[PDB]
Design a protein around this nucleic acid. Sequence first.
RNA 1: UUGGCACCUCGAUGUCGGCUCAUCGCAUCCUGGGGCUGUAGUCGGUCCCAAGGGUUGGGCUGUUCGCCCAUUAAAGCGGUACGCGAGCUGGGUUCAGAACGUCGUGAGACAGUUCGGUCCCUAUCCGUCGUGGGCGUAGGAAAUUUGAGAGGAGCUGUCCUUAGUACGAGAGGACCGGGAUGGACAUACCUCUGGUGUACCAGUUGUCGUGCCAACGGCAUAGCUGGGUAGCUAUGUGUGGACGGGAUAAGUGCUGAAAGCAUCUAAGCAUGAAGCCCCCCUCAAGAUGAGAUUUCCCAACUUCGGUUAUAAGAUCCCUCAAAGAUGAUGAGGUUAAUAGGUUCGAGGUGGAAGCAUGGUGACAUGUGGAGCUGACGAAUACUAAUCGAUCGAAGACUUAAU
RNA 2: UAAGGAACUCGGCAAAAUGACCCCGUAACUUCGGGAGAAGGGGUGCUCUUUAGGGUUAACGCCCAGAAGAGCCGCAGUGAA
Lengths: 48, 215, 114, 122, 120
Amino acid sequence: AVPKRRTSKTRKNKRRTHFKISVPGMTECPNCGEYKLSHRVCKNCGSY
Amino acid sequence: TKGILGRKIGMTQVFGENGELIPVTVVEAKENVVLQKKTVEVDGYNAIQVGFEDKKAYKKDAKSNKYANKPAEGHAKKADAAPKRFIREFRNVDVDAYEVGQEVSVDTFVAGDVIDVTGVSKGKGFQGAIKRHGQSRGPMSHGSHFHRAPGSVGMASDASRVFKGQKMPGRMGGNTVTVQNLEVVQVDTENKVILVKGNVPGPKKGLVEIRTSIK
Amino acid sequence: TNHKLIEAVTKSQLRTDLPSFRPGDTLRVHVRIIEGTRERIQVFEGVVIKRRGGGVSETFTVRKISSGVGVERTFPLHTPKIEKIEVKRRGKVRRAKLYYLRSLRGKAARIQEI
Amino acid sequence: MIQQETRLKVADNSGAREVLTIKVLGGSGRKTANIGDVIVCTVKNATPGGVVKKGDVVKAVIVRTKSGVRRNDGSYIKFDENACVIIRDDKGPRGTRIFGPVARELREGNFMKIVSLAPEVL
Amino acid sequence: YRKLGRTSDQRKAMLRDLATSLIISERIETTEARAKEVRSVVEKLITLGKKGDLASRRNAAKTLRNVEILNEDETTQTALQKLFGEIAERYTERQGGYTRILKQGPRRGDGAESVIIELV
RNA sequence: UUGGCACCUCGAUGUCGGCUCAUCGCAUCCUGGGGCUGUAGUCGGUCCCAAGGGUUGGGCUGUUCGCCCAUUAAAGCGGUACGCGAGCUGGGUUCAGAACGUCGUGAGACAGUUCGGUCCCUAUCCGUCGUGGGCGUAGGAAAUUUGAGAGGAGCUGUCCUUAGUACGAGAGGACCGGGAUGGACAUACCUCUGGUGUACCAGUUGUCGUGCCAACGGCAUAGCUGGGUAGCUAUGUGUGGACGGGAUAAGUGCUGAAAGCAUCUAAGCAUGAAGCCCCCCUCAAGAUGAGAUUUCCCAACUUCGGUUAUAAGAUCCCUCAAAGAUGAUGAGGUUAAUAGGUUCGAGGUGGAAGCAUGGUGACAUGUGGAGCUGACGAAUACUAAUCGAUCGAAGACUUAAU
RNA sequence: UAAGGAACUCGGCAAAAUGACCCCGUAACUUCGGGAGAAGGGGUGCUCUUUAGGGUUAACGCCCAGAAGAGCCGCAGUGAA
């Protein structure tokens, strides 16, 4: 029910090894405009 | 009789002479070919290696398992054959038969043969409680608060721990299962099917691996 | 069209010498029972309660009052133990499964003709 | 599918009418019994006269259940009620006259005298 | 089929509403799981509309809620009339299709994947 | 077990019986193997070996315990904080109310009866059940595998033949062999029998709406009622454990001295248990001892400090299900049948709407096994699986044969 | 929710079942008021005729039918709450 001992800095930081986010798909809109998300459509700010 | 691979189609029934009902499983086993053959001098044990059903040829930018890749192409071409989906080894057969490249036909088996079938059982997700281990419920009534949980897990002090075989929730799932001493009811050479008496593991259109019975 | 291979491999065991009927009809079924050293024919006559299934797996059920007691028999439609089936009368009903007959009695469980 | 505490209907003229089942004979842990099985029972209702009185503990054989039985050719014989017949320690009936139909599975149990007296065996 | 976080009658209700406003506007914006479900509800309506007879006009009235459209030249017609009138004559030779889905980015308030379902 | 002692715990080690779930000992209840018998046969008595598996439903009491009713091959005795309340209950007893008996001058008391009486906690660490990411395994990959080790399984009844034979005055009645079938348990599956089946078909009540009739929609538990596909299922359908080899226990022996005889033992040689090791089923090279086979791929710059660009091969992303908490697994990504709109079927329901005819009318008949139809089988690129990006090797030394 | 129907449990706890209206019938006991809604039975939709009282009213008509026949439909007629 309750923690018996406090958690140290090193154990807390080991537990957060996998707690991250990843970079998205990001294909480039060739005809006009900047990057867009892949398999998506950007009617404005992109020709694709 | 010795060994063959096939897909599971479904179940039906057949009337045996003397007019008794026989439940039956339809197994379709076409395109069995002998690939590499292993020997005790090269490998340490005797076996033959069989491939079941053919996929498409190598394509430059394939992206699924529908097309063979270069190593599978080479391996399946060393014996003059097309690439296969499934490949298994049979150690119970006599290796001095079966030239490499032969076709294993469905009539190697005959009606009345006793066989063993090996599939992968089918897929039940996290189910654990009284479904996984066939355990009893608690009362549904008088004051209960205990319905589908597991019981106690262990003792006090003496075992300050649980034990290595304790039965707890954790996915039913898809193990490998062998059913022994079934029987061949009928062999159909034009459609390339075998009728097995009973039921065999796995979902429809899964791989079955028939072998002669060891007992 | 159940599945090509299943229908192909069981097609040799379908019978063709069977009349058409539907639930509500009265039937006479000539059953071939095997005694010790004989093959006697025995007749079961009743009303068709239901028909389920398809292909070689099809079955039907007939109900009768024997000695004050209701009795039901279920047969596979294509079994070779049935030597003959004849339709005695056509009833007029309004559903496929006549389960309500199980609670009726006397002359309340009569079926209309036509 | 007859288990302990099931009420049955007696189908002979031995005096009993509405026996209640105490035990399913067979082996340890056995739960249910069907057509052709022997049970131990107690008489809950009876006619004046008769050989069996009331609160007697007797043995009966099941004929005619409501769940029915399945035959090897794939056909079924469900009935409309549960019934039984009180027997005399050698599979011989205790009464002398059997009512209603019985199933042709007692014949493979050496219950020949019961099948002989039955009006209809199906 | 898929439950859309609703009960049986809330689901059926908002699915008729989604199918009706697509026939009015030809083009609507919604979430992805809803689009993938209304896709197959709208095309059966268009199938009913291409048959044209009275028996099918009455089957289409079980869906297709009840609205008035005010087109140019002050023409007022119902949704059931617009369907059987011009939507059916448009796709009189397609053999299926009739709709396409286009994905957009995630919505701000929640992470929902936004989508445009249009009428080809 | 009832006690003796007072060593841990009074800034809490918090409860009898039952339920759920077990695990160990053997001083053995059943099943296996034997010796003796005051063992004729069938049954028994007593002792020795043996822990593999098995070891029941009710009535009465809060009851442990016990008595009784029916079974069974058998209904073993103990340890685990008299196993198990951060897993459950709360009948009993050390709580406030009330009453009886009894004791007390009384307030009250008994350990005597009786009726009523609040069961808290979101799991940090070890442990256990499932499931992934990283690196390693002297080049990098794809697939198929050996098995050091580990887990699972391990029960037993009745009937028929030998044979009414052996035994026995008779009554009664076998050993050893050979066949059928069951009970309980395990685990795979949905053809059959059933259950469910809230986007399938039909009937029907009240009220509101679509202007009215007809036909429909909403709400009333899915309004209610009768059926029911796929999937998931037991009470349904299949299969398994009574085999065989090796070494042993109690026991039985052969030859054989010490000890001119005798003696199973001291040298030697056999035999002998549902127990030990294999045989049967599953996992298994993180087995850092990191194994084996088949096939695929192979570069330059360079200050080789590393930089690039890559190969075989993967992945991001997208369409999915025979898979699934997520991730993982498997089917596909246009040189395409992955979803699955359209067309055709299977199965389900049970005779649509409209019109016509008969009837005073409620209604009936015809057109017509009609119409409708989620998940199941086919066919068909009509809609969507676009264009792209990322990752990814360059085979070291020493010695001996060649 | 098959088959069974208290075998559950300290204890039928919880759930299931009864339920509106009309007609018939109703025990022991009793302080003669009761018990009593004792228990236990049967019925109910729609259409058309005949009757047909309250007669709504001038009146059949307004309206419950006051009631009896003859028909029609369903698995089911206080068809839901």
